Every structure is written in structure tokens, then in C-alpha cells.
Amino acid sequence: QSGQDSGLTAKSQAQQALNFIRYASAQVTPPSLPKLSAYSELWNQATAKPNS
Amino acid sequence: DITQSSKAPNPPYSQLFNSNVVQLVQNYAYNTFLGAIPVDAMSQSLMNFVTD
């Protein structure tokens, strides 16, 4: 099988199964990880030695 | 009651009641189970439960 070549495509019936199963697992919307700037200032604030 | 041969099974039977009947019934059972499952259907390679 040779599907349309734009991003993810299944090249086999097995790939059709894999792409289904990942589609159901909703991995295409991975969770929003922290902002660099925000998390970084809370990092600087928390990981530091207190009162120093 | 081995002493009496009159009521003994005559003719004696060892075969199934109807091997042909259960044969055909199980045949359509297998056919209906194998074909009754839906399958992703656009091109011949894609309804193949089994490989070559």
C-alpha cells in the first residue's frame, strides 16, 4: 500500500492498524507541557536555597 | 440382558446419527462466523484477515 504522502500514512494493513490504535489513544494531542518562561521563574524561585 | 438376542440392537449401529447433517450445519456456521465479522473494505488487500 502506498497512500497519500502528507505526514503520517499507513504503508500496510498493519500500519493501518497501528495508525488506528494510536489515533484512539489520542496521542496526536499530547498534553500541554509547561511554558519555558513561566516554569523557569517558578524553578528559580523554588529550587533555590531559602534565605540566601 | 445378554441372555436375549431378540431385543438386542439389530442391526448394530456404531456411526453417528447423521454425520452429514452436523457436517453441513457446522459448515455454514464456520462460513457465517468468518464472513459475518465486518471488515475495512475498499481494496482487496484490505479485507485480508490472513496473508498469502
TrEMBL record, chain B:
Protein's UniProt name = IcmX (IcmY)
Q: Which residues of the full protein are shown?
A: 53 to 104 of 466
